[PDB]
């Protein structure tokens, strides 16, 4: 059975980067000629493997992490990145085995009224571990007084929303990213 890689890339909706959905790729034959010879990507760069040698190579499972970041903050999608996205939304482990794919989706993710559906949980106490997911809306306490779930001075809301617009530059347009991980069933 062919791997269902169309379901994860041409999908109408991806989750926000703070709430990135992880998919395990079950037993299936992969077709990576669909993902290298086709070139819709603004960034297509692989870590520890190549863009063409991945065909005659295969792994015990794949994890696909589908999410939305901003185009400059795709530079924060690497091992050893420490940006607001890496520390607080999606941290690719150092020994990350896999390929990172990024494409401009300003046609379906940017609107003239401002798209505030895509959030990014911009405030957190301490950093994230390798592939930690934290969707908690627990009020961001910056001070000694307990926030008790109510906002105020030193009590800021831990989510901040994107403001995606068609009138921003390439560094500020909405970009879809899905990252394929490899771990040591799925061969092709």
């Amino acid at each position: 059975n062919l791997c269902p890689f169309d379901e994860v890339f041409n999908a109408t909706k991806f989750p926000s980067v703070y709430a990135w959905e992880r998919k395990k790729i079950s037993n299936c034959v992969a077709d990576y000629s669909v993902l290298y010879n086709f070139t819709p990507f603004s960034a297509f760069k692989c870590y520890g493997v190549s863009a063409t040698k991945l065909n005659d190579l295969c792994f015990s499972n794949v994890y696909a992490d589908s999410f939305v970041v901003k185009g400059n903050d795709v530079s924060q999608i690497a091992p050893g990145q420490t940006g607001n996205i890496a520390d607080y939304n999606y941290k690719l482990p150092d020994d990350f085995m896999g390929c990172v794919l990024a494409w401009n989706t300003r046609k379906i993710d940017a609107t003239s009224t401002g798209n505030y559906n895509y959030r990014y949980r911009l405030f957190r106490k301490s950093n994230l571990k390798p592939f930690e997911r934290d969707i908690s809306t627990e009020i961001y306490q910056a001070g000694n007084k307990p926030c008790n779930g109510v906002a105020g001075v030193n009590c800021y809301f831990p989510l901040q929303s994107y403001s995606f617009r068609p009138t921003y530059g390439v560094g500020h347009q909405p970009y879809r990213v899905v990252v394929l991980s490899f771990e040591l069933t799925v061969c092709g």
Epitope: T82, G83, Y88, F123, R124, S126, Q141, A142
Partner: antibody, heavy 119, light 107 residues
């Protein structure tokens, strides 16, 4: 009230450790963006270093590898250790906070201190 | 790094004259650049955050607008208490870079 206090500034030799202390109240340093902004006499402002609330370190190229920004979560204070100080490191150093998340301005401020570097 | 140009570096006008200070960036910076009032012997004070919103406790004489690479500090009525230098700091992307300075004086 919202406040910061800069302290430990003055004269020190090149590569000396005055370790500018920035005591906080009503906000916790373990959970905040906090920045060193300096100004040489008769110059514009410049950036030095910043800490994300997770502890994440950054450095401007004029201060990279020579300075290190740090904090004491128990004492509620920020520290910038300075090493390989120079004649151009004579400036008025402020400890202050850009409101976390980029949208909002730089709410928390101290009055700043002058560090002078001379023979 | 990301360069900027403030224009002018200093200006002088009579009480109530409209003050306009520009800031040009090397690339699109959205809105996260802020404007700052530097008084001699004070901590520098904020003017506008989001490059379009007055901070609470900023005077209503200050206002800001723009997008992309050009920004404009607007003062609609100049006041005697405004004698200061002004800055356009960006925190838009690393490396973070401060503005060149613009001193206003009253004639």
């Amino acid at each position: 009230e919202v406040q910061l206090v800069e302290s430990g500034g003055g004269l020190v030799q090149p590569g000396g450790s005055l370790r500018l202390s920035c005591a906080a109240s009503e906000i916790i340093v373990s959970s905040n963006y906090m920045r060193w902004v300096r100004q040489a006499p008769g110059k514009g402002l410049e950036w030095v270093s910043d800490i994300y609330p997770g502890g994440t370190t950054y450095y401007a190229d004029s201060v990279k590898g020579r300075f290190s920004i740090s904090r004491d979560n128990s004492k509620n204070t920020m520290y910038l250790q300075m090493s390989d100080l120079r004649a151009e490191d004579t400036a008025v150093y402020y400890c202050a906070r850009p409101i976390m998340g980029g949208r909002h301005g730089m709410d928390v401020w101290g009055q700043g201190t002058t560090v002078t570097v001379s023979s | 790094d990301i360069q900027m140009t403030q224009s002018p570096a200093s200006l002088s006008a009579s009480v109530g004259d409209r003050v306009t200070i520009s800031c040009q960036a090397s690339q699109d910076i959205n809105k996260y650049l802020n404007w700052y009032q530097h008084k001699p012997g004070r901590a520098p004070k904020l003017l506008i955050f989001d490059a379009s919103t007055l901070e609470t406790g900023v005077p209503s004489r200050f206002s800001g607008s723009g997008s992309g690479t050009h920004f404009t500090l607007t003062i609609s009525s100049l006041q005697p208490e405004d004698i200061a230098t002004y800055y356009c700091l960006q925190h838009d992307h690393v490396p973070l870079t401060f503005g060149g300075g613009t001193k206003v004086e009253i004639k």
